[PDB]
Amino acid sequence: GDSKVKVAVRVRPMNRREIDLHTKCVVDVEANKVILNPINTARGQPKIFAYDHCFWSMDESVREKCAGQDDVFKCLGENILQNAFDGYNACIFAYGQTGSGKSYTMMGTADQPGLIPRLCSGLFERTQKEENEEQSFKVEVSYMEIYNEKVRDLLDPKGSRQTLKVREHSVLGPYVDGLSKLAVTSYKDIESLMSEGNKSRTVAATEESSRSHAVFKITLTHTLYGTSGEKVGKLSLVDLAGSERATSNINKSLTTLGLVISALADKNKFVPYRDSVLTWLLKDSLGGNSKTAMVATVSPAADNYDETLSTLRYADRAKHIINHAVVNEDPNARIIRDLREEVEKLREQLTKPELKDRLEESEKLIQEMTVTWEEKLRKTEEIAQERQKQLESHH
Ligand SMILES: Nc1ncnc2c1ncn2[C@@H]1O[C@H](COP(=O)(O)OP(=O)(O)O)[C@@H](O)[C@H]1O
Ligand SMILES: [Mg+2]
Ligand SMILES: [Mg+2]
């Protein structure tokens, strides 16, 4: 192919509990190597893994955390940002057990912002820095959640817990029908949409559920100007569910993800993309048209050994997957062209069942992606002010 899926392993520092209760540290880092030591030093031998990148921290001090997040972004964030500005599809997904540091890496906290806020900030910084009257940038965003093979729109002002149907089109592929793609023009729009989205996650029986997947997506459309050309880069930041074992199809997407990774590691006929919602929607990110990075977060202490190992192993396979990313030039024109063509052919065959409203679907897709930019702005605005009025009757 062209490029291999790049793999980084992030080892979170020993927390207060692990130090107080004298839980033994079994994971240590040697440059780009991850060494997993046995728990009771018969096959108690140190296991050594090698990856593209390895992050670690000496303690939980604010200095080391700031340095940590900075390191992670400098190593992975700016690269995929550059990919976005080069018209490439790019993706970063966090894999690991609950409490290893997936969300802390992807989203981070208020004092320790993760990959996503830095990515958005840097994105709008660069766009605002480069935009001429010959160069223009259009930025869209979406945030979805996948729980129990059901998709929810996290950017919907009304967290109605209503599932959105996942449908397939012949020329478009897998898509979430009804998902919000909101036009944004600054970091704060994204910030409010994200703060609202992050408090709309699926609750557990007790504390957000660790069984849900979170997919954040940025679309960057660059136009160069007596005619104009266009490139589109799509970033996909994914915070997966906890990889640990069970303590129906609640773990379908995770297991299927494992199977997909394993299959690719060894025309997608026997790669089970379709066996789950997650692998189906993120099919192009794994062995497809995308620059893909995996961040495997692991816990350092012995009490998580078998999990850590597992994670490591999966990571070790992920670096064998080969993607083939290309620059997406004027994809919208091609898509609407193929869509209208298909509409006409469906119109012709219709004059001779499953084609009755397939054309309806195609026309719907056409009309929805021919929506003017201004109306998208107005949409995002009314959504925003409805969020501003939903806290009015609640105050
Ligand atoms: N690399 C890290 N460095 C410092 N603290 C971390 C790190 N990763 C996780 N943590 C700490 O442990 C907490 C749990 O992390 P979290 O992102 O919720 O894990 P997960 O999403 O996989 O369940 C975090 O709030 C953070 O304080
Ligand atoms: Mg989390
Ligand atoms: Mg999108």
Side-chain angles (χ1 to χ4, degrees), residues 183-206:
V184 287
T185 60
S186 70
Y187 172 75
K188 170 166 189 139
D189 299 336
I190 295 191
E191 183 186 25
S192 60
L193 286 169
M194 181 171 53
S195 61
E196 253 298 325
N198 285 324
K199 59 168 55 185
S200 297
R201 301 296 299 271
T202 296
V203 295
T206 324

PDB file of all heavy atoms in Angstrom, residues 183-206:
ATOM      1  N   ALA A 183     -22.121  23.701  10.754  1.00  0.00           N
ATOM      2  CA  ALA A 183     -21.119  24.643  10.275  1.00  0.00           C
ATOM      3  C   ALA A 183     -20.604  25.514  11.416  1.00  0.00           C
ATOM      4  O   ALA A 183     -21.388  26.111  12.152  1.00  0.00           O
ATOM      5  CB  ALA A 183     -21.698  25.510   9.167  1.00  0.00           C
ATOM      6  N   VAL A 184     -19.284  25.585  11.559  1.00  0.00           N
ATOM      7  CA  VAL A 184     -18.678  26.397  12.610  1.00  0.00           C
ATOM      8  C   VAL A 184     -17.638  27.354  12.032  1.00  0.00           C
ATOM      9  O   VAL A 184     -16.988  27.047  11.033  1.00  0.00           O
ATOM     10  CB  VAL A 184     -18.022  25.519  13.692  1.00  0.00           C
ATOM     11  CG1 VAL A 184     -19.088  24.844  14.543  1.00  0.00           C
ATOM     12  CG2 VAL A 184     -17.103  24.488  13.056  1.00  0.00           C
ATOM     13  N   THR A 185     -17.485  28.514  12.665  1.00  0.00           N
ATOM     14  CA  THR A 185     -16.597  29.553  12.150  1.00  0.00           C
ATOM     15  C   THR A 185     -15.556  30.012  13.169  1.00  0.00           C
ATOM     16  O   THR A 185     -14.745  30.890  12.879  1.00  0.00           O
ATOM     17  CB  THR A 185     -17.395  30.786  11.685  1.00  0.00           C
ATOM     18  OG1 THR A 185     -18.130  31.327  12.789  1.00  0.00           O
ATOM     19  CG2 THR A 185     -18.360  30.408  10.571  1.00  0.00           C
ATOM     20  N   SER A 186     -15.582  29.419  14.358  1.00  0.00           N
ATOM     21  CA  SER A 186     -14.616  29.759  15.399  1.00  0.00           C
ATOM     22  C   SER A 186     -14.463  28.615  16.391  1.00  0.00           C
ATOM     23  O   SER A 186     -15.229  27.651  16.361  1.00  0.00           O
ATOM     24  CB  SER A 186     -15.036  31.035  16.131  1.00  0.00           C
ATOM     25  OG  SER A 186     -16.183  30.807  16.931  1.00  0.00           O
ATOM     26  N   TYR A 187     -13.477  28.722  17.275  1.00  0.00           N
ATOM     27  CA  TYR A 187     -13.237  27.667  18.250  1.00  0.00           C
ATOM     28  C   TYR A 187     -14.342  27.581  19.296  1.00  0.00           C
ATOM     29  O   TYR A 187     -14.608  26.507  19.823  1.00  0.00           O
ATOM     30  CB  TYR A 187     -11.887  27.856  18.953  1.00  0.00           C
ATOM     31  CG  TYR A 187     -11.699  26.888  20.103  1.00  0.00           C
ATOM     32  CD1 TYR A 187     -11.415  25.548  19.868  1.00  0.00           C
ATOM     33  CD2 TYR A 187     -11.834  27.306  21.421  1.00  0.00           C
ATOM     34  CE1 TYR A 187     -11.257  24.657  20.914  1.00  0.00           C
ATOM     35  CE2 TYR A 187     -11.678  26.423  22.471  1.00  0.00           C
ATOM     36  CZ  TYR A 187     -11.390  25.100  22.212  1.00  0.00           C
ATOM     37  OH  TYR A 187     -11.234  24.219  23.257  1.00  0.00           O
ATOM     38  N   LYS A 188     -14.983  28.704  19.606  1.00  0.00           N
ATOM     39  CA  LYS A 188     -15.959  28.714  20.692  1.00  0.00           C
ATOM     40  C   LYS A 188     -17.261  28.005  20.317  1.00  0.00           C
ATOM     41  O   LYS A 188     -17.896  27.392  21.174  1.00  0.00           O
ATOM     42  CB  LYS A 188     -16.255  30.146  21.153  1.00  0.00           C
ATOM     43  CG  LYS A 188     -17.446  30.231  22.103  1.00  0.00           C
ATOM     44  CD  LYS A 188     -17.560  31.557  22.837  1.00  0.00           C
ATOM     45  CE  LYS A 188     -18.633  31.458  23.918  1.00  0.00           C
ATOM     46  NZ  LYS A 188     -18.235  32.139  25.181  1.00  0.00           N
ATOM     47  N   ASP A 189     -17.657  28.080  19.049  1.00  0.00           N
ATOM     48  CA  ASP A 189     -18.821  27.329  18.581  1.00  0.00           C
ATOM     49  C   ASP A 189     -18.615  25.841  18.855  1.00  0.00           C
ATOM     50  O   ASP A 189     -19.440  25.178  19.506  1.00  0.00           O
ATOM     51  CB  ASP A 189     -19.061  27.564  17.089  1.00  0.00           C
ATOM     52  CG  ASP A 189     -19.347  29.016  16.760  1.00  0.00           C
ATOM     53  OD1 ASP A 189     -19.804  29.753  17.657  1.00  0.00           O
ATOM     54  OD2 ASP A 189     -19.117  29.419  15.599  1.00  0.00           O
ATOM     55  N   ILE A 190     -17.489  25.336  18.359  1.00  0.00           N
ATOM     56  CA  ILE A 190     -17.083  23.960  18.588  1.00  0.00           C
ATOM     57  C   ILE A 190     -17.008  23.662  20.079  1.00  0.00           C
ATOM     58  O   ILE A 190     -17.403  22.593  20.513  1.00  0.00           O
ATOM     59  CB  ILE A 190     -15.717  23.660  17.936  1.00  0.00           C
ATOM     60  CG1 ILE A 190     -15.816  23.768  16.415  1.00  0.00           C
ATOM     61  CG2 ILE A 190     -15.225  22.278  18.328  1.00  0.00           C
ATOM     62  CD1 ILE A 190     -14.596  23.243  15.688  1.00  0.00           C
ATOM     63  N   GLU A 191     -16.522  24.622  20.858  1.00  0.00           N
ATOM     64  CA  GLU A 191     -16.332  24.431  22.293  1.00  0.00           C
ATOM     65  C   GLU A 191     -17.654  24.236  23.025  1.00  0.00           C
ATOM     66  O   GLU A 191     -17.771  23.369  23.886  1.00  0.00           O
ATOM     67  CB  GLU A 191     -15.581  25.618  22.897  1.00  0.00           C
ATOM     68  CG  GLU A 191     -15.271  25.452  24.376  1.00  0.00           C
ATOM     69  CD  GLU A 191     -14.666  26.696  24.993  1.00  0.00           C
ATOM     70  OE1 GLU A 191     -14.911  27.803  24.469  1.00  0.00           O
ATOM     71  OE2 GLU A 191     -13.945  26.567  26.003  1.00  0.00           O
ATOM     72  N   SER A 192     -18.645  25.053  22.684  1.00  0.00           N
ATOM     73  CA  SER A 192     -19.959  24.968  23.306  1.00  0.00           C
ATOM     74  C   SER A 192     -20.679  23.705  22.848  1.00  0.00           C
ATOM     75  O   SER A 192     -21.309  23.011  23.654  1.00  0.00           O
ATOM     76  CB  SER A 192     -20.795  26.209  22.983  1.00  0.00           C
ATOM     77  OG  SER A 192     -20.990  26.346  21.587  1.00  0.00           O
ATOM     78  N   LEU A 193     -20.578  23.405  21.555  1.00  0.00           N
ATOM     79  CA  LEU A 193     -21.159  22.176  21.019  1.00  0.00           C
ATOM     80  C   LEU A 193     -20.555  20.935  21.680  1.00  0.00           C
ATOM     81  O   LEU A 193     -21.234  19.926  21.877  1.00  0.00           O
ATOM     82  CB  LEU A 193     -20.961  22.109  19.504  1.00  0.00           C
ATOM     83  CG  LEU A 193     -21.846  23.034  18.669  1.00  0.00           C
ATOM     84  CD1 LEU A 193     -21.376  23.063  17.222  1.00  0.00           C
ATOM     85  CD2 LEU A 193     -23.293  22.583  18.754  1.00  0.00           C
ATOM     86  N   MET A 194     -19.279  21.032  22.033  1.00  0.00           N
ATOM     87  CA  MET A 194     -18.527  19.931  22.621  1.00  0.00           C
ATOM     88  C   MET A 194     -18.827  19.780  24.111  1.00  0.00           C
ATOM     89  O   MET A 194     -18.886  18.672  24.636  1.00  0.00           O
ATOM     90  CB  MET A 194     -17.030  20.163  22.394  1.00  0.00           C
ATOM     91  CG  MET A 194     -16.101  19.090  22.916  1.00  0.00           C
ATOM     92  SD  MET A 194     -14.421  19.393  22.332  1.00  0.00           S
ATOM     93  CE  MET A 194     -14.172  21.087  22.862  1.00  0.00           C
ATOM     94  N   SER A 195     -18.997  20.911  24.787  1.00  0.00           N
ATOM     95  CA  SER A 195     -19.307  20.899  26.208  1.00  0.00           C
ATOM     96  C   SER A 195     -20.729  20.398  26.408  1.00  0.00           C
ATOM     97  O   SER A 195     -21.020  19.695  27.376  1.00  0.00           O
ATOM     98  CB  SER A 195     -19.131  22.290  26.819  1.00  0.00           C
ATOM     99  OG  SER A 195     -20.007  23.227  26.218  1.00  0.00           O
ATOM    100  N   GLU A 196     -21.612  20.760  25.482  1.00  0.00           N
ATOM    101  CA  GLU A 196     -22.982  20.264  25.514  1.00  0.00           C
ATOM    102  C   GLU A 196     -23.038  18.791  25.117  1.00  0.00           C
ATOM    103  O   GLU A 196     -23.815  18.018  25.677  1.00  0.00           O
ATOM    104  CB  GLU A 196     -23.878  21.093  24.592  1.00  0.00           C
ATOM    105  CG  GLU A 196     -24.828  22.019  25.331  1.00  0.00           C
ATOM    106  CD  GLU A 196     -25.811  21.266  26.208  1.00  0.00           C
ATOM    107  OE1 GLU A 196     -26.228  20.155  25.817  1.00  0.00           O
ATOM    108  OE2 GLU A 196     -26.166  21.784  27.287  1.00  0.00           O
ATOM    109  N   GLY A 197     -22.209  18.409  24.152  1.00  0.00           N
ATOM    110  CA  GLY A 197     -22.159  17.032  23.696  1.00  0.00           C
ATOM    111  C   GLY A 197     -21.621  16.077  24.744  1.00  0.00           C
ATOM    112  O   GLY A 197     -22.095  14.948  24.869  1.00  0.00           O
ATOM    113  N   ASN A 198     -20.632  16.535  25.506  1.00  0.00           N
ATOM    114  CA  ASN A 198     -19.974  15.695  26.501  1.00  0.00           C
ATOM    115  C   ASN A 198     -20.823  15.454  27.745  1.00  0.00           C
ATOM    116  O   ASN A 198     -20.539  14.550  28.529  1.00  0.00           O
ATOM    117  CB  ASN A 198     -18.632  16.310  26.906  1.00  0.00           C
ATOM    118  CG  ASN A 198     -17.562  16.125  25.845  1.00  0.00           C
ATOM    119  OD1 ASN A 198     -17.516  15.097  25.168  1.00  0.00           O
ATOM    120  ND2 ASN A 198     -16.698  17.121  25.695  1.00  0.00           N
ATOM    121  N   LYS A 199     -21.863  16.261  27.927  1.00  0.00           N
ATOM    122  CA  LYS A 199     -22.780  16.057  29.043  1.00  0.00           C
ATOM    123  C   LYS A 199     -24.079  15.417  28.565  1.00  0.00           C
ATOM    124  O   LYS A 199     -25.106  15.490  29.240  1.00  0.00           O
ATOM    125  CB  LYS A 199     -23.072  17.377  29.763  1.00  0.00           C
ATOM    126  CG  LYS A 199     -23.675  18.457  28.884  1.00  0.00           C
ATOM    127  CD  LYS A 199     -24.208  19.609  29.723  1.00  0.00           C
ATOM    128  CE  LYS A 199     -23.132  20.178  30.633  1.00  0.00           C
ATOM    129  NZ  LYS A 199     -23.674  21.224  31.544  1.00  0.00           N
ATOM    130  N   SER A 200     -24.026  14.790  27.393  1.00  0.00           N
ATOM    131  CA  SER A 200     -25.179  14.090  26.842  1.00  0.00           C
ATOM    132  C   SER A 200     -24.855  12.618  26.614  1.00  0.00           C
ATOM    133  O   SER A 200     -25.548  11.926  25.868  1.00  0.00           O
ATOM    134  CB  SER A 200     -25.633  14.739  25.533  1.00  0.00           C
ATOM    135  OG  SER A 200     -26.065  16.071  25.746  1.00  0.00           O
ATOM    136  N   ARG A 201     -23.795  12.146  27.262  1.00  0.00           N
ATOM    137  CA  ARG A 201     -23.363  10.760  27.125  1.00  0.00           C
ATOM    138  C   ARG A 201     -24.326   9.807  27.824  1.00  0.00           C
ATOM    139  O   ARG A 201     -25.121  10.219  28.668  1.00  0.00           O
ATOM    140  CB  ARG A 201     -21.950  10.581  27.685  1.00  0.00           C
ATOM    141  CG  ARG A 201     -20.897  11.443  27.007  1.00  0.00           C
ATOM    142  CD  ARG A 201     -20.733  11.071  25.542  1.00  0.00           C
ATOM    143  NE  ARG A 201     -20.292   9.690  25.375  1.00  0.00           N
ATOM    144  CZ  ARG A 201     -19.017   9.311  25.334  1.00  0.00           C
ATOM    145  NH1 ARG A 201     -18.051  10.212  25.449  1.00  0.00           N
ATOM    146  NH2 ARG A 201     -18.710   8.030  25.180  1.00  0.00           N
ATOM    147  N   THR A 202     -24.247   8.530  27.463  1.00  0.00           N
ATOM    148  CA  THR A 202     -25.100   7.508  28.059  1.00  0.00           C
ATOM    149  C   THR A 202     -24.706   7.243  29.507  1.00  0.00           C
ATOM    150  O   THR A 202     -23.542   6.973  29.804  1.00  0.00           O
ATOM    151  CB  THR A 202     -25.034   6.187  27.266  1.00  0.00           C
ATOM    152  OG1 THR A 202     -25.550   6.392  25.945  1.00  0.00           O
ATOM    153  CG2 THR A 202     -25.850   5.106  27.958  1.00  0.00           C
ATOM    154  N   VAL A 203     -25.681   7.327  30.407  1.00  0.00           N
ATOM    155  CA  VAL A 203     -25.440   7.064  31.819  1.00  0.00           C
ATOM    156  C   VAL A 203     -25.445   5.564  32.101  1.00  0.00           C
ATOM    157  O   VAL A 203     -26.097   4.793  31.396  1.00  0.00           O
ATOM    158  CB  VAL A 203     -26.491   7.757  32.711  1.00  0.00           C
ATOM    159  CG1 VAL A 203     -26.365   9.269  32.598  1.00  0.00           C
ATOM    160  CG2 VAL A 203     -27.894   7.303  32.336  1.00  0.00           C
ATOM    161  N   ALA A 204     -24.711   5.156  33.131  1.00  0.00           N
ATOM    162  CA  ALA A 204     -24.627   3.748  33.501  1.00  0.00           C
ATOM    163  C   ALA A 204     -25.682   3.394  34.543  1.00  0.00           C
ATOM    164  O   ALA A 204     -26.611   4.164  34.784  1.00  0.00           O
ATOM    165  CB  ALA A 204     -23.236   3.419  34.020  1.00  0.00           C
ATOM    166  N   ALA A 205     -25.534   2.224  35.154  1.00  0.00           N
ATOM    167  CA  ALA A 205     -26.433   1.800  36.220  1.00  0.00           C
ATOM    168  C   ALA A 205     -26.065   2.497  37.525  1.00  0.00           C
ATOM    169  O   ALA A 205     -26.888   2.617  38.433  1.00  0.00           O
ATOM    170  CB  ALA A 205     -26.393   0.291  36.388  1.00  0.00           C
ATOM    171  N   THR A 206     -24.819   2.954  37.609  1.00  0.00           N
ATOM    172  CA  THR A 206     -24.345   3.692  38.773  1.00  0.00           C
ATOM    173  C   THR A 206     -24.187   5.168  38.412  1.00  0.00           C
ATOM    174  O   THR A 206     -23.130   5.765  38.613  1.00  0.00           O
ATOM    175  CB  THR A 206     -23.007   3.130  39.293  1.00  0.00           C
ATOM    176  OG1 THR A 206     -22.993   1.706  39.143  1.00  0.00           O
ATOM    177  CG2 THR A 206     -22.810   3.483  40.764  1.00  0.00           C
TER     178      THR A 206
END
